[PDB]
Amino acid sequence: AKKMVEREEAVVWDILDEVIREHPVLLNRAPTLHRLGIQAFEPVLIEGKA
Amino acid sequence: ARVTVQDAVEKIGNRFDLVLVAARRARQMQVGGKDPLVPEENDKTTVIALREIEEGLINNQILDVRERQEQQEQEAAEL
Amino acid sequence: AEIKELLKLGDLPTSGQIRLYDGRTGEQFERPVTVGYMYMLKLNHLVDDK
Amino acid sequence: VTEFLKPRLVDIEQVSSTHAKVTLEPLERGFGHTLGNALRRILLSSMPGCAVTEVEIDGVLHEYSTKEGVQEDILEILLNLKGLAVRVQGKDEVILTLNKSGIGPVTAADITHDGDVEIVKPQHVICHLTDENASISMRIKVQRGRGYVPASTRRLLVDACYSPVERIAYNVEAARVEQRTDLDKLVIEMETNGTIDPEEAIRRAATILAEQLEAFVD
Amino acid sequence: FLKPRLVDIEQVSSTHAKVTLEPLERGFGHTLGNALRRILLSSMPGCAVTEVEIDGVLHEYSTKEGVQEDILEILLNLKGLAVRVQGKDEVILTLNKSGIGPVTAADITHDGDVEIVKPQHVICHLTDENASISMRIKVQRGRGYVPASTRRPIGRLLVDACYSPVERIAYNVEAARVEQRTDLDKLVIEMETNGTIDPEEAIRRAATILAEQLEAFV
Amino acid sequence: KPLVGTGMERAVAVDSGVTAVAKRGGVVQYVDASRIVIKVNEDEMYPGEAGIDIYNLTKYTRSNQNTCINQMPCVSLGEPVERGDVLADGPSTDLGELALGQNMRVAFMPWNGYNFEDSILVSERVVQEDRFTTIHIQELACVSRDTKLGPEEITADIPNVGEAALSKLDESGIVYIGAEVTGGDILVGKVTPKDSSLRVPNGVSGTVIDVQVFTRDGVEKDKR
Amino acid sequence: GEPIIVPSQDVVLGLYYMTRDCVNAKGEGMVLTGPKEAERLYRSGLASL
């Protein structure tokens, strides 16, 4: 499975689209003064670097 | 995909308890071999548990009663 | 005034704003917009190192 | 080099009888808007249809003159009349009359059926008669055309809407085939009036656009 | 209805021209124009270099004694070469100049199919009587912008491909002088090519791409 | 060049050492992509052992912030060069004029919200023409030191590695200058007394431009 | 107790430009059927925003 992951085969992306469906992530800025600094978000996969 | 959980928190006002009572259902559907009571709409176990809570099919009392029934069945199985 | 004279020395509009059409629809943007040539330089805070 | 991706997968979802949301997943990078805007324009301003263009009350001549009976103003009657959608036969002109009297909703059911107008929805209320003695009555000037013709470009004149479409939009999102650059995904939300189904209109607009590109076929 | 046909295709210069579609009906002018501009600009077959193999140099960031420019400058100049092939896709050229004097595209040994449309394009400058440069340029067909990152011997140098025989497309719908029917307009399309495609063929191919993409919802 | 500038663009460039300024006026004799030889005029020429002023240009070299420092010639054979004339631009310099960036066609208008609080929309023409593609140079190093049970050696004799791993390595154990190495590939062949060869760090890519082998006095140089 | 999702810069400008009035623009005094007809009329070009 490790080798399959590093090879970045086409099947890996399809699997990743399944483990990402309803898995919230906690986006967080650096100076989180109030509680709204760290908020959950559902992931949408993009092709950029940001 | 449940976007807002307001309909779910109608059942449990505390909200902290709502997470605790849905974790049990999610574990029962993930670890244990229990089929969901709602039509599985290609959603993960957590969203299925939340949706089940919304319809009024799963709460603390019903889940505890089901656990008691399972315990009674285990007692019958062990003679 | 000197910049206006410079613009009039060519054929560009003296106001500095032209009628910029839109790519997708092909319709016209009302309220003509400013078009020009600004010196943009890329900072070295890239994203490949972040 | 000549094998541009073609969107074979098309799904139609009918939210209502008159409202549909079609889609095309594969498409190509930069073809979503190119198709959507063209389709929107061609079926919004250049579609064949049939509607009404002018109606004449029995005596009321001014745009602001009033009649007894119906509480609806003559302007409101004209506003309600253009909403009515009629589909006719090869005849390019037909005159429909009305003479109904008595207290009650004057719907399209009482239209003096005459020749053939196929009132799409016969319970379309035009005016409301409130006095038994009074009698609201007119004669309609039904014709055929293409697009929206306001009264300004062209007796009580009212805007005529020949196009059988009501509201069409088009949105473009991002879809991926295997591993590839993001490919546009098209979604058209068409809402018709009742004479023709959304799919039929979207199928006629494409035919018209294809017929336009006939001299250039390689 | 009226169906547009090409009537006049003038060539003011070798690069840019002006195509005219005379009998266009009202409304379809702009609809055809925007789509035929987007399709023309985005997807059009063209030929550009993909791999360059110098005789002595090893990598891109290395100078060469006898050439006034770095190898990077030579590659950048080679990227903008207007080459029109007639036949197979992959065709390999060969340049061989020895002597002081600016080398041009004419120095490239022409084959029976490849024909450089701009013989004055300067590649590099030799600044000695005892200097020689030899390259193997591989030219292949393509579509769009294909970078060198997504796409083995040490000698081979990879250059980004920019297959686009169109640079600037601008149309303008003018009111036609067709007297019998009014409201008719003509579509005048100006295209600034690089010298590889013919305006008539490019317009026809764009129209056919539109036609093929129209077959989805029809 | 900056389309609109202040006027001090010809001072920061010349005053800094980024550009090679002529020390003696004359006529260019032999201009190449790496060297420029200028034959000075007779009046400037010193009486004995004089006549030519060789200028060596620094090609692609690492900077202190991992950028490229390249000096492109700007003169031609026959052009009369005078004292103080910049005959070779450096990094970010065009005809002896400070050029830190590029001038682009800018239109001020909101566009579907993609240019939000400070975001900027960039047409693909910018990327296609390689207007902002910058060169970055790094420098990985491998040190061989005397070790317990004998010193380490750089020989391409690494144990338990594939032929493909050693394909980049030369018979001596250094990667060819020109190979396009990526993450995980082998760069040197350091063998320690009983496989500690330097490898490309995960993520780093590119092509090798040059290789330096510093040796100590009293040790025989390797074949590479 | 105030909303935390507040339109900040571009959307508010778009809505402000959308919901204004001009003393004399093309398509004045017309009796529009509904919002659908308003959208059709603006998109076609026979009237102004």
mmCIF file with all atom_site columns, C-alpha atoms in Angstrom, chain A:
data_model
loop_
_atom_site.group_PDB
_atom_site.id
_atom_site.type_symbol
_atom_site.label_atom_id
_atom_site.label_alt_id
_atom_site.label_comp_id
_atom_site.label_asym_id
_atom_site.label_entity_id
_atom_site.label_seq_id
_atom_site.pdbx_PDB_ins_code
_atom_site.Cartn_x
_atom_site.Cartn_y
_atom_site.Cartn_z
_atom_site.occupancy
_atom_site.B_iso_or_equiv
_atom_site.pdbx_formal_charge
_atom_site.auth_seq_id
_atom_site.auth_comp_id
_atom_site.auth_asym_id
_atom_site.auth_atom_id
_atom_site.pdbx_PDB_model_num
ATOM 1  C CA . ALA A 1 1  ? 0.000   0.000  0.000   1.00 0.00 ? 1  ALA A CA 1
ATOM 2  C CA . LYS A 1 2  ? 2.906   2.352  0.712   1.00 0.00 ? 2  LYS A CA 1
ATOM 3  C CA . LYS A 1 3  ? 4.372   1.722  -2.744  1.00 0.00 ? 3  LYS A CA 1
ATOM 4  C CA . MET A 1 4  ? 0.949   2.188  -4.342  1.00 0.00 ? 4  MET A CA 1
ATOM 5  C CA . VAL A 1 5  ? 0.645   5.530  -2.535  1.00 0.00 ? 5  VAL A CA 1
ATOM 6  C CA . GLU A 1 6  ? 4.076   6.838  -3.562  1.00 0.00 ? 6  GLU A CA 1
ATOM 7  C CA . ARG A 1 7  ? 3.438   5.789  -7.164  1.00 0.00 ? 7  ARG A CA 1
ATOM 8  C CA . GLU A 1 8  ? 0.346   8.072  -7.139  1.00 0.00 ? 8  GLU A CA 1
ATOM 9  C CA . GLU A 1 9  ? -1.594  5.599  -9.257  1.00 0.00 ? 9  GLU A CA 1
ATOM 10 C CA . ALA A 1 10 ? -5.049  6.405  -10.601 1.00 0.00 ? 10 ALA A CA 1
ATOM 11 C CA . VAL A 1 11 ? -6.754  4.077  -8.108  1.00 0.00 ? 11 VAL A CA 1
ATOM 12 C CA . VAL A 1 12 ? -5.261  6.037  -5.198  1.00 0.00 ? 12 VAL A CA 1
ATOM 13 C CA . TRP A 1 13 ? -7.123  9.218  -6.154  1.00 0.00 ? 13 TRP A CA 1
ATOM 14 C CA . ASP A 1 14 ? -10.455 7.382  -6.365  1.00 0.00 ? 14 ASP A CA 1
ATOM 15 C CA . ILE A 1 15 ? -9.855  5.933  -2.895  1.00 0.00 ? 15 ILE A CA 1
ATOM 16 C CA . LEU A 1 16 ? -8.929  9.385  -1.579  1.00 0.00 ? 16 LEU A CA 1
ATOM 17 C CA . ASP A 1 17 ? -12.210 10.748 -2.939  1.00 0.00 ? 17 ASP A CA 1
ATOM 18 C CA . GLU A 1 18 ? -13.980 8.244  -0.642  1.00 0.00 ? 18 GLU A CA 1
ATOM 19 C CA . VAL A 1 19 ? -12.074 8.891  2.609   1.00 0.00 ? 19 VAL A CA 1
ATOM 20 C CA . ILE A 1 20 ? -12.638 12.641 2.111   1.00 0.00 ? 20 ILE A CA 1
ATOM 21 C CA . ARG A 1 21 ? -16.430 12.683 1.582   1.00 0.00 ? 21 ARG A CA 1
ATOM 22 C CA . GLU A 1 22 ? -17.563 13.703 5.093   1.00 0.00 ? 22 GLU A CA 1
ATOM 23 C CA . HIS A 1 23 ? -14.273 14.204 6.970   1.00 0.00 ? 23 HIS A CA 1
ATOM 24 C CA . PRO A 1 24 ? -14.192 17.733 8.429   1.00 0.00 ? 24 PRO A CA 1
ATOM 25 C CA . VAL A 1 25 ? -10.864 19.521 8.863   1.00 0.00 ? 25 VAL A CA 1
ATOM 26 C CA . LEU A 1 26 ? -10.052 22.327 11.305  1.00 0.00 ? 26 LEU A CA 1
ATOM 27 C CA . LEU A 1 27 ? -8.692  25.280 9.364   1.00 0.00 ? 27 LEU A CA 1
ATOM 28 C CA . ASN A 1 28 ? -6.850  27.526 11.798  1.00 0.00 ? 28 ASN A CA 1
ATOM 29 C CA . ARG A 1 29 ? -5.102  30.892 11.595  1.00 0.00 ? 29 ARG A CA 1
ATOM 30 C CA . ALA A 1 30 ? -2.062  31.781 13.687  1.00 0.00 ? 30 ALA A CA 1
ATOM 31 C CA . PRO A 1 31 ? -3.406  34.525 16.030  1.00 0.00 ? 31 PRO A CA 1
ATOM 32 C CA . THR A 1 32 ? -6.630  32.807 17.142  1.00 0.00 ? 32 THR A CA 1
ATOM 33 C CA . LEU A 1 33 ? -7.864  35.334 19.681  1.00 0.00 ? 33 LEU A CA 1
ATOM 34 C CA . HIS A 1 34 ? -11.551 34.376 19.827  1.00 0.00 ? 34 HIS A CA 1
ATOM 35 C CA . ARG A 1 35 ? -13.165 30.967 19.416  1.00 0.00 ? 35 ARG A CA 1
ATOM 36 C CA . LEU A 1 36 ? -14.059 31.619 15.763  1.00 0.00 ? 36 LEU A CA 1
ATOM 37 C CA . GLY A 1 37 ? -10.376 31.364 14.858  1.00 0.00 ? 37 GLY A CA 1
ATOM 38 C CA . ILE A 1 38 ? -10.445 27.582 14.447  1.00 0.00 ? 38 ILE A CA 1
ATOM 39 C CA . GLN A 1 39 ? -13.467 26.482 12.406  1.00 0.00 ? 39 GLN A CA 1
ATOM 40 C CA . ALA A 1 40 ? -14.357 23.150 10.838  1.00 0.00 ? 40 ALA A CA 1
ATOM 41 C CA . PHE A 1 41 ? -14.774 22.731 7.085   1.00 0.00 ? 41 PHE A CA 1
ATOM 42 C CA . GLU A 1 42 ? -15.603 19.928 4.684   1.00 0.00 ? 42 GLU A CA 1
ATOM 43 C CA . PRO A 1 43 ? -12.756 19.378 2.179   1.00 0.00 ? 43 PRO A CA 1
ATOM 44 C CA . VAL A 1 44 ? -13.137 19.976 -1.553  1.00 0.00 ? 44 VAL A CA 1
ATOM 45 C CA . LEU A 1 45 ? -10.174 18.604 -3.484  1.00 0.00 ? 45 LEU A CA 1
ATOM 46 C CA . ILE A 1 46 ? -8.485  21.066 -5.851  1.00 0.00 ? 46 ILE A CA 1
ATOM 47 C CA . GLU A 1 47 ? -5.368  20.926 -8.034  1.00 0.00 ? 47 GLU A CA 1
ATOM 48 C CA . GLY A 1 48 ? -3.497  24.023 -6.830  1.00 0.00 ? 48 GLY A CA 1
ATOM 49 C CA . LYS A 1 49 ? -1.118  24.479 -3.895  1.00 0.00 ? 49 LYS A CA 1
ATOM 50 C CA . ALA A 1 50 ? -3.228  26.675 -1.614  1.00 0.00 ? 50 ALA A CA 1
#
